[PDB]
Chain length 146, copies 8
C-alpha cells in the first residue's frame, strides 16, 4: 500500500464514518481522487465493511463461546464452513492448525440455546463440537494499522 | 431496547456510515431525535465503535492466531488483559472456562514476529502461551441482530 | 420469586421438616395461604423434594465416581440422559460445555461394579465413558439461599 | 447397618418429613426406640440432613460449574477443602484420583461472578482452577438405597 | 487369613522355594498341615503362582512399555483382555479409570517388534493403542505383606 | 544365552520350585553342573528372585493404582526412585518417556489410604502425583521366555 | 562398522563432496578399494545420500510443520507412510510411540497450501491430522558421528 | 532465486557431489562464474551444507526421539536452542506453535542414554521435557525443489 492508501486506511480504521472531504483534507487529495481510492480499497478487499460494532449482550446474546469442530469423517473434504454459514449465531469461522479443524465464535441467548445450537451444528455439518465458553470480553475488534 | 432503538441498532450494524437522515426515515423520527438516541446507545455502550473493518493481510498481518494464556502464578490476581492491553497486536481478549484463563486473537507479520510477540506477552503478563494458528478465515465479524 | 416465597424456600432449605404451621408463622401467612404457596413452589420445580440426605458409604456405595460421557455419533441427538435415567446408580446427570457432553455422579458398591456400570451406560446410550474416581467427600449438598 | 436401620434410612431417604411415629410403625418399633436409633444414625453421619432440595436456578444461581483444582505446591498438604469451606457458593467438594486433586460443584449468579469466585478460590487455597460449565441439569440428588 | 496363614504367605512371598519343613518350623506345625494350608491358599487364589522372576533383557526383551488401549466401539462389550490373552508379549492387563480402558505391560525385542505388536493388539481387540515406553526399571515386583 | 541356560531359564520361569535334580534331568546335566549354572544365572541377574506371587487383595491391598510422578523441579536430578524406595506400598518404579517422568504401581488398603500415600510420596520426593486407579487385574506377571 | 569404515563415514558426513583420492590418503588405502567400500556403505544403506542441504525457505517453502497422523481405523494395517510416499511436500515420516501413529515433517508455500496438503494426506491414507507449525528452525540436520 | 540459481540449487539438491564443470554445462555458464554463484548461494545460506546423509542406526544411534521442551519459567527469554546448541545428540531444534515451546530431534545409543540426555537438556536450559520416541523412520531428508 502506498503512502496515501495507508493514510486512508488508517483513518477509516480509526472511524468508518470519516467523510470523503475529511479524508481528502487529511490525505492531501481532492474529494474525487479519494472517492476513487476508497472504492478501490473496497473492491480489492482492503476495506471489508463498515458495520458499527454492537454489544452482543445488548441485543440478547448473553452467552458467547468459541466452538471447535472436527469433521466426523476427516478423510473426505468436509466443507464445514460453507455448510454452516447460514447459521446466524456463527459470527466467524476459521480453519486452524492443531487438534481441531475449525474454530467458530458463537453467540446465543442462553445455555439451553447453546446446547441446541451445538446439536444443530453437529447435524448440519456432520462434525463434533468442543465448546469453550467466554466469561468476559475484556476488549475486542482492535485493529492494528502499522 | 424499544422497537425503535432496535431499528437504529440494526441499521448501524448493517453500515456504520448510515446518516442521521437515513436513520430518521427508516426509524420514523426527526434527525435530532435519532441523533439523541444514537448518542444514548453509544453512551450505554450498546454501540461500541465505528471503525471500518480492514483486511489484516492488506496491512502486513499475514499470520493470525488464537493465543490461550495461563498465569504462571494462578494464586495471584493476574490482571493479564489489563497488563497486555497496550499491546497492539492483540485484537481481542476473553476470559474463558476450561484449562487456560484467557484466549486472545493476535495478528503479526510473520512466524518470527509471532515468536517475538508470544515472548513479549509472557514477559508482560507473567503467563504461559499456547498458540493456535489460523490457516484461513472463511468469514468473520458477522453480527446477528435478531 | 417474591419475598414471601424466598422466606419459605429459605426455611425449607434449612430443614424440610418445618410444618406448614411453622411456615405460615415464619412467613406472615395463614396456614391455608402457605399451603397454596408451597404447592405452587413444588409444581413449579422450585422445591424439588424432601429427601433426607444419606451418607452413600453407610449404605454400601463404597465407590463414587464422576463419569463424563461423549456420544459415539455426535451427528445425532443422543438423548443420553433420558436413555440412562432408569439407571439407579446415577445420582445426577448434567450436560456440560467442553470436550465431553455430559457429566454424571454415580454410586456403586465396588471398583468392579463400577466397571460393569460403565459398560452398561456405554451400551445403553451409545457413548464413550471417562471416569474420575472420588477418594473422599469433604462436604456436599450445601444449598445456599441468598 | 442392621435391617431396622435400613428401613429407617430407606424411609428417611424417600421423605425426610416422615414422623418418628410413622417411623416406629414402619420399622416395628416403639416411638422411644426409634428416637434413639434415629439420633444414633444422625450422630454417626449416616443421616446427613433434612434439607428440602431447592432448584438453584429458581434462587438466582443461573450458572453452575464443576471446578477441578490442583494445588500449586503439591509438596505440601494443601488442606484446600478446609480452606475453602466457608465459601458458600461451593455446594460440594471431593478429592479425586487423576490429574486434578479436587472437584467442587459451585453455584453462582452469572459468568462474571463465576470468574470472581474462581480467583477467590485460587487465592484462598493456593490452587489452580479448571472449570467445566453446566448447560443443563437433567436430574440430580437421586439417592438409591439398595 | 489367620495369623498362621499370614506367616505361610509371608514366607512364600519371601521365597517361593521355601520347603514344607521350613514352613513347619517357621509356622509351628507339621508338614502335612502346612502342605494342606498351602494347597488351600493356592486354591483360594491367595498364592497365585511360583514362577521365578526373569530379567526380561536376558531373554531378548530389550524394550518394555505400558500400552493403554481403548476399544474403537465402546458401545459394544469389547472383551479386550480375554481377546488378547493369548498374546505372550502381554505380561499384565488391567482395566483402569480415566480416558483409556485398559493398561498393559508389554515386552518386545525392539522398536520394530513393538510396532508389530501394537498393530497385532489393535487388530486382535479392535482397539486404539497409546504406548508409554519404559526407559529404566529402578525396582519392581516388590510385594508388601503387612 | 546358550541352549542349556535357555532350558534352565524356561523351567525356572515355569516354576521357581523346580528342583536341581528335576533341572539336571531336563537339561541333561549332572546336579552339580546345574547348581553351578543356576547360581551363575542368579549372580548375572538373569534370575532375579523366587518370591511366590501373592494376591494383593488377599493381604488387604484392596486398592491399586498406577501413579505417574513428575519432579516439581525438573531442572535438577530428582533421584525420585531412590528417595521413595523405602515406601513399601510402592511395588515398582519405572522411568518413562512422555509427559511424566516415572510410573509406579502402588497398593493400599483404601481410597483414604491412597490419598495419604500420595501426599507422603509428594513430600518425600518433591514431585507431583497423577493417579490412574485399577478397576481389575485381568492377568499379570506373565513372563515370556522365547 | 570397522576401523576403516568409521573414517569413510565420518569424512563423508563432514561433506559428501570429499573425493575418492582424499578418502584414500585419509584411510591409508587405495582409490579403488576405497571406492568399492564406499559403493558398499551405500548399498548397506549406511550412506543414504549426498544431497546438499538447501534452505526450504529460500525455495519458497515458507511454512513448515510437524504433522502427526492417526489412521481413522487403527484396527487394520494402515500402510500410511507408503501410501503417502509419493507426496513430495513430505520431507520425512516416522512411526512414533504415543497418541498419534506417525509424525511427518512437511514443507509448503503457505497456510492455505498446508490446509490443502493436510486434506490431501487425510484422503490418501485415510487418517486424521494434527499439525504443529514450526515458527523457526534454529539448527537442523546435525549428524554426530561418535 | 533467479533462473540460473534455480538450477544450481536443484542440481546440488540432487547430489552435492556434482562438480563445478557439470554445473557449468547444465547452467550454460562457466566453471568460474558458476563457482562464485555457488560460493554465494552458500554465503546467502541458500545452500546450507554438503554432508552425506548417514544412517544414525549404523553409527550406534539405536534410539531416536522428538523432544518437546518448555522453559520452566516462560516469562523470560529462555534462549534454549543456543544454550543447547553445544549438545551433539541434538540433530535439530525448532520453535513451534502449540503447548511446548520447542521440539528437537535427538539421537542416542539407548533408553538409558536418552534418560541421561533428557536430564542434561533440562539442566542446561532449565526446561521440562516430553519425549516422543521414534519406532521407525520410513523416509527422511527428502527435499522438494519446485
Amino acid at each position: 500500500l502506498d503512502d496515501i492508501d495507508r493514510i486512508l486506511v488508517r483513518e477509516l480504521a480509526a472511524d468508518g464514518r470519516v467523510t470523503l472531504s475529511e479524508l481528502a483534507t487529511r490525505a492531501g487529495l481532492s474529494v474525487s481522487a479519494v472517492q476513487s481510492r476508497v472504492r478501490r480499497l473496497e473492491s480489492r478487499g482492503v476495506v471489508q465493511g463498515y458495520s458499527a460494532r454492537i454489544n452482543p449482550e445488548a441485543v440478547g446474546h448473553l452467552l458467547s463461546a468459541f466452538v471447535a469442530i472436527t469433521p466426523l469423517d476427516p478423510s473426505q473434504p468436509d466443507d464445514a464452513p460453507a455448510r454452516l454459514e447460514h447459521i446466524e449465531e456463527v459470527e466467524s469461522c476459521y480453519s486452524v492448525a492443531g487438534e481441531e479443524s475449525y474454530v467458530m465464535l458463537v453467540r446465543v441467548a442462553s445455555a439451553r440455546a447453546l446446547e441446541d445450537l451445538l446439536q444443530r451444528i453437529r447435524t448440519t455439518a456432520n462434525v463434533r463440537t468442543r465448546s469453550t465458553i467466554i466469561l468476559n470480553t475484556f476488549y475486542s475488534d482492535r485493529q492494528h494499522i502499522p
